[PDB]
Design an enzyme around this catalytic site. Sequence first.
Site, PDB file in Angstrom:
ATOM      1  N   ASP A  51       0.707  -1.160   0.053  1.00  0.00           N
ATOM      2  CA  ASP A  51      -0.110  -0.291   0.261  1.00  0.00           C
ATOM      3  C   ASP A  51       0.919   1.352  -0.093  1.00  0.00           C
ATOM      4  O   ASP A  51       1.756   1.511   0.387  1.00  0.00           O
ATOM      5  CB  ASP A  51      -1.115  -0.165   0.999  1.00  0.00           C
ATOM      6  CG  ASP A  51      -2.597   0.633   0.714  1.00  0.00           C
ATOM      7  OD1 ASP A  51      -3.102   0.686  -0.322  1.00  0.00           O
ATOM      8  OD2 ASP A  51      -2.474   1.881   1.399  1.00  0.00           O
ATOM      9  N   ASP A  85       5.353   3.873   3.083  1.00  0.00           N
ATOM     10  CA  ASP A  85       5.233   5.719   3.264  1.00  0.00           C
ATOM     11  C   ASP A  85       4.643   5.845   4.669  1.00  0.00           C
ATOM     12  O   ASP A  85       4.319   7.075   4.494  1.00  0.00           O
ATOM     13  CB  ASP A  85       4.075   5.001   2.209  1.00  0.00           C
ATOM     14  CG  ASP A  85       2.756   4.488   2.704  1.00  0.00           C
ATOM     15  OD1 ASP A  85       2.662   3.421   3.211  1.00  0.00           O
ATOM     16  OD2 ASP A  85       1.440   4.374   2.316  1.00  0.00           O
ATOM     17  N   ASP A  99       4.517 -18.286 -38.943  1.00  0.00           N
ATOM     18  CA  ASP A  99       5.212 -18.657 -39.897  1.00  0.00           C
ATOM     19  C   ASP A  99       4.859 -20.830 -40.475  1.00  0.00           C
ATOM     20  O   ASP A  99       3.681 -20.518 -40.949  1.00  0.00           O
ATOM     21  CB  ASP A  99       6.897 -19.642 -39.718  1.00  0.00           C
ATOM     22  CG  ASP A  99       7.729 -19.986 -40.399  1.00  0.00           C
ATOM     23  OD1 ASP A  99       8.204 -19.555 -41.031  1.00  0.00           O
ATOM     24  OD2 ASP A  99       7.638 -21.274 -40.479  1.00  0.00           O
ATOM     25  N   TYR A 144      15.881 -22.251 -50.739  1.00  0.00           N
ATOM     26  CA  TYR A 144      16.181 -23.362 -49.333  1.00  0.00           C
ATOM     27  C   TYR A 144      14.998 -24.609 -49.514  1.00  0.00           C
ATOM     28  O   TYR A 144      14.965 -25.167 -48.606  1.00  0.00           O
ATOM     29  CB  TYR A 144      16.056 -22.232 -48.498  1.00  0.00           C
ATOM     30  CG  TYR A 144      14.155 -21.698 -48.063  1.00  0.00           C
ATOM     31  CD1 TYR A 144      14.321 -22.667 -47.221  1.00  0.00           C
ATOM     32  CD2 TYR A 144      13.636 -20.649 -48.629  1.00  0.00           C
ATOM     33  CE1 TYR A 144      12.302 -22.435 -46.425  1.00  0.00           C
ATOM     34  CE2 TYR A 144      12.560 -20.039 -47.914  1.00  0.00           C
ATOM     35  CZ  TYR A 144      11.785 -20.624 -47.296  1.00  0.00           C
ATOM     36  OH  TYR A 144      10.750 -20.458 -46.523  1.00  0.00           O
ATOM     37  N   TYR A 176       7.695 -29.731 -44.960  1.00  0.00           N
ATOM     38  CA  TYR A 176       8.457 -29.123 -46.183  1.00  0.00           C
ATOM     39  C   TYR A 176       8.041 -29.823 -47.268  1.00  0.00           C
ATOM     40  O   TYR A 176       8.076 -29.465 -48.671  1.00  0.00           O
ATOM     41  CB  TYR A 176       9.100 -28.273 -45.982  1.00  0.00           C
ATOM     42  CG  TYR A 176       9.476 -27.075 -45.102  1.00  0.00           C
ATOM     43  CD1 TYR A 176       9.926 -26.496 -45.976  1.00  0.00           C
ATOM     44  CD2 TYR A 176      10.191 -27.595 -43.622  1.00  0.00           C
ATOM     45  CE1 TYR A 176      10.221 -24.668 -45.250  1.00  0.00           C
ATOM     46  CE2 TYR A 176      10.627 -26.101 -43.172  1.00  0.00           C
ATOM     47  CZ  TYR A 176      10.578 -24.821 -43.953  1.00  0.00           C
ATOM     48  OH  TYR A 176      10.955 -23.596 -43.219  1.00  0.00           O
ATOM     49  N   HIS A 213      12.080 -12.053 -39.632  1.00  0.00           N
ATOM     50  CA  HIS A 213      11.101 -13.084 -39.484  1.00  0.00           C
ATOM     51  C   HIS A 213      10.562 -13.969 -38.437  1.00  0.00           C
ATOM     52  O   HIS A 213       9.500 -13.942 -38.436  1.00  0.00           O
ATOM     53  CB  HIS A 213      12.001 -14.190 -40.415  1.00  0.00           C
ATOM     54  CG  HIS A 213      10.820 -15.846 -40.490  1.00  0.00           C
ATOM     55  ND1 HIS A 213      10.975 -16.147 -39.984  1.00  0.00           N
ATOM     56  CD2 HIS A 213       9.863 -15.361 -41.217  1.00  0.00           C
ATOM     57  CE1 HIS A 213      10.329 -17.319 -39.630  1.00  0.00           C
ATOM     58  NE2 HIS A 213       9.314 -16.741 -41.099  1.00  0.00           N
TER      59      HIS A 213
HETATM   60  O1  LIG Z   1       9.730 -22.015 -44.376  1.00  0.00           O
HETATM   61  C1  LIG Z   1       9.449 -20.610 -43.830  1.00  0.00           C
HETATM   62  N1  LIG Z   1       7.947 -20.297 -43.392  1.00  0.00           N
HETATM   63  C2  LIG Z   1       7.323 -21.220 -44.335  1.00  0.00           C
HETATM   64  C3  LIG Z   1       5.662 -21.024 -43.921  1.00  0.00           C
HETATM   65  C4  LIG Z   1       4.480 -21.991 -44.787  1.00  0.00           C
HETATM   66  C5  LIG Z   1       5.077 -21.254 -46.122  1.00  0.00           C
HETATM   67  C6  LIG Z   1       6.260 -21.623 -46.477  1.00  0.00           C
HETATM   68  C7  LIG Z   1       7.756 -20.643 -46.075  1.00  0.00           C
HETATM   69  N2  LIG Z   1      10.288 -20.213 -42.530  1.00  0.00           N
HETATM   70  C8  LIG Z   1      11.901 -20.506 -42.716  1.00  0.00           C
HETATM   71  C9  LIG Z   1      12.281 -20.216 -41.498  1.00  0.00           C
HETATM   72  C10 LIG Z   1      13.950 -20.466 -41.535  1.00  0.00           C
HETATM   73  C11 LIG Z   1      14.784 -20.262 -42.953  1.00  0.00           C
HETATM   74  C12 LIG Z   1      13.583 -19.042 -43.193  1.00  0.00           C
HETATM   75  C13 LIG Z   1      13.068 -19.336 -43.346  1.00  0.00           C
END
Ligand SMILES: O=C(Nc1ccccc1)Nc1ccccc1
Lengths: 546, 546
Positions: free
Chosen positions: A10, A184, A334, A382, A465, A523
């Site tokens: 308080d 206080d 992401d 990538y 992926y 990112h």
């Molecule tokens: O691949 C990445 N994102 C992906 C999300 C779904 C749709 C296609 C893109 N990010 C990746 C993170 C690590 C390296 C840099 C990019």
Amino acid sequence: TLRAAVFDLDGVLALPAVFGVLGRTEEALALPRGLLNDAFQKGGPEGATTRLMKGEITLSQWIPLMEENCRKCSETAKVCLPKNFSIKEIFDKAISARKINRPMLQAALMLRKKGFTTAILTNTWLDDRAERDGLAQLMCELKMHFDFLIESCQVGMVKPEPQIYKFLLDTLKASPSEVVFLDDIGANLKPARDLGMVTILVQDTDTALKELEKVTGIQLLNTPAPLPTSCNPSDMSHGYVTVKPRVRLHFVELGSGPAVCLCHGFPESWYSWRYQIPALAQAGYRVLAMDMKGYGESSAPPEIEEYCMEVLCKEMVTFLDKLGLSQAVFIGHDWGGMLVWYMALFYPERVRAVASLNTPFIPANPNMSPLESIKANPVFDYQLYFQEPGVAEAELEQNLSRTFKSLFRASDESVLSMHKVCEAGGLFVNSPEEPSLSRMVTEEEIQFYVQQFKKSGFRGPLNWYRNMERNWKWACKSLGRKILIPALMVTAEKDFVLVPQMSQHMEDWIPHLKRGHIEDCGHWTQMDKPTEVNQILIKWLDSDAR
Amino acid sequence: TLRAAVFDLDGVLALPAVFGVLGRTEEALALPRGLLNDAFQKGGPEGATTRLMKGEITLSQWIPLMEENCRKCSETAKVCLPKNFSIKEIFDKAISARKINRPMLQAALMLRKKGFTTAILTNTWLDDRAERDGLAQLMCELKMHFDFLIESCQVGMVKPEPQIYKFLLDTLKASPSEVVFLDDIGANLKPARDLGMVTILVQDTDTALKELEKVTGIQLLNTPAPLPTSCNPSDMSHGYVTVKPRVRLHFVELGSGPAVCLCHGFPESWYSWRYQIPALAQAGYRVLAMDMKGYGESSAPPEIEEYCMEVLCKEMVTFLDKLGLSQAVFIGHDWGGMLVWYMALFYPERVRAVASLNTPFIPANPNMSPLESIKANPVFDYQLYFQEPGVAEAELEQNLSRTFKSLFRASDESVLSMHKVCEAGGLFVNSPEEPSLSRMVTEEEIQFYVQQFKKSGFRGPLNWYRNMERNWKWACKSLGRKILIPALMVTAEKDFVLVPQMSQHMEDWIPHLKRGHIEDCGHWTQMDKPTEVNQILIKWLDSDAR
Ligand SMILES: O=C(Nc1ccccc1)Nc1ccccc1
Ligand SMILES: O=C(Nc1ccccc1)Nc1ccccc1
């Protein structure tokens, strides 16, 4: 040499002071000065208020006693109290009006960051009022930031009796001259000083913090904007749900209210949300920060098909089913951002609202194979490197600390180039063996990710992926649909993979779409600009998610 | 030989049928007969409704299309629709009015109990309405009771097309003659019959269940009152919270809403609440069924002092702290019932409401040592047997299956005598080596407790009885207090240890105390009379806990 800081509640950590309402009530009700403050302290050490503060009686048992002391006081002053006069009503709005003194908490937080032991020492009561939860929440929000909370009512001792001070010193395992004490009330400061403690009499916070900074030698006033509260993994509640034989999902859980499901990206963790978890819980939400399939403590099956969007979404529904949740707000980043759009397209009854950081919603193209679409964007090279099972795994797993240090970098920090990854032969071929530490992460936060990735590696993560064609065929089934549930798209100015421009046509499929945009943000949205993420999410949750 | 049962949702598992609202709307609005049911089916297989049912479009995208088909229908009938005419409003209250057909679910539950594979096969939509959660909850409550839920909108197929039937058979891994199929639409039943399935045309449930019982040869109609839904431990969400180094607390978690913390007694488990967990979650609560310190997956430190009430209560507060919960409703049984009264006396701001099964609240006697009080009641002799470390442990751990089989017995089942336990030399000295199985438990439920008790044994559990003097001194500090937060005392008529009479003076300390009483109920309240416990708890929660 000071090494401990003790704060009163308080008028010190919480404002306005509940004590100062007795005088405000006297002035408002035109009663004699100090009539109410005198009835509060009637009987001194043998009186009602001391018994309340020592935990002998509860706040509701005290209410009628204080009322009686008010009549005895008015009788002597030759006055009368209003016929609306209620001690319960006075203390109800007083406790309710009392909020954290943010600059004082920031100074305590800075002192603890500098190796100081912090403690709250307070004369308080056992609150059994119907409205007690308000104060319970306040005590919870404050206490988490301190090494000790010493409440008079739980220890059976009160300030200014010198036993509580000797109790404080024994709890602190410190000599009086190693301790700063802020109060206080001049009277409650006196025994701490008499024992030889550094004492500060707090009126206004600014003067108090000038005195506090002069004595500890630490800058507490005019200091930069601090980061939001983060998470210590060992202090979290950890949840585990079996979604099918050999597939279990792990999550960290904090708060009460509507369920908010946090979905990280690649190659992340529930821990990527560390700055959002305390903030969203404090905002009135039940946070479930996932370890997505393939990561941390969640199962990581080796098969590619286990990571296709249809299977991942079905498992997230089962996850809600096993937890007894009809809905959750789904917040993704992401790859998690991609999953959240698919949860909203395929399971709208289970999704209360959908939010995505960086990942745009783009309908599948039925006239182009997903691999042709990937080749049409040079920044997506990538992803072709990620296709061959074992190739990216070997590079990503070779040196874990180097992996996270090269990836987790802010826009200003020589960010990893994503162009001609396949030609170059790998992701880190033009990268140092020993990369510097980004301003976004400590060495300890990097090691947590290294530790998490030691269990299953990158096979499960990279498999997200490896289902481009599977996902495309499933997505083509939703081409006639529109996302008409609450939705939020957050773009990050400097994300050069998931560029803000890629999200421009979203209103064609999500007409009621709400937006957020973070400038100078790369990112890794959550750790790059946590304050801005927290601000955008809480504002959207309170307006569109409830 | 039938081995599978398939149920439709609308007009079969859920009533009233949403289809039957089009006719009710026609009659109420004095519109031509079948005008609305015709606009619903306009275009047949190429129409709006088929696209909705195949998952091509969502419910909100369909609403305007149905509205258009209603005008085209009224144009031909040479009529006009009301100016308040809203398809959204009609389907909103229709879906909302639709509830589970309890007798139909009970028959499905009985069929699954008899080894049948059960499935829900439904023509449904992707619901993205603001009010979708109502239906999400309904689907959740139903689906949990079945092996499969096949929704037209998720599989892209609709009844009466014969592909969904071939999909159903492949999901069931069954030949058409092994399958009973129940539908309210004659047309959707036709392809199942044409394939050779046993088919039932459902109008009223009673006739339908007579047909269903005649064909399977199983009694489904006029059957006794079934037990509430229980828990399968592997299907639960499991939570873990570290409360201090080397002390972790385990809990099972189900539902959303206000937090309800379940606290078992001796020598129990979170599993002792198996019949309450699904029921309370369904009632609108977030259930946290604990493994109390010393049990199951919770840590079991060996020291006696780790099990005193002050330490146990402090850890339960830390548990709330680490989970980000300002409050929880605390529901305890036996030793858990004792802890819940102490949570309410010492931490009222953290306890939303307190409920106890069998355990009365009796203030500590400062003029009598707790061991003198124990000797003053012959039924409490066993507690003196429990005092010597290692003695009761050796007997209780010698044969685990015998331990739980002798203890977990209903009032009618030759219950274990608690008198002259110390003289006799033990708890089971006059007990068979191979006790019979109580009507309260299956052999499998006994083995779960045997398995749980293999980790830590009875040291931690028996230690709850080894702090009589410690607890007494702590309790004497609360002698001036009253419990003035919401409270419920539930007595069990035939509990001969915790007799209903022991609770008679409770109103002196808990004046607003609410009561519940279970007749023909022994000590193991939860498993003895689960239906009555569930009824008393839910009624009290909805009125006093919110
Ligand atoms: O691949 C990445 N994102 C992906 C999300 C779904 C749709 C296609 C893109 N990010 C990746 C993170 C690590 C390296 C840099 C990019
Ligand atoms: O000891 C038991 N209860 C205990 C609860 C706290 C106050 C004192 C009594 N139950 C015991 C369960 C196993 C054997 C029969 C009684």
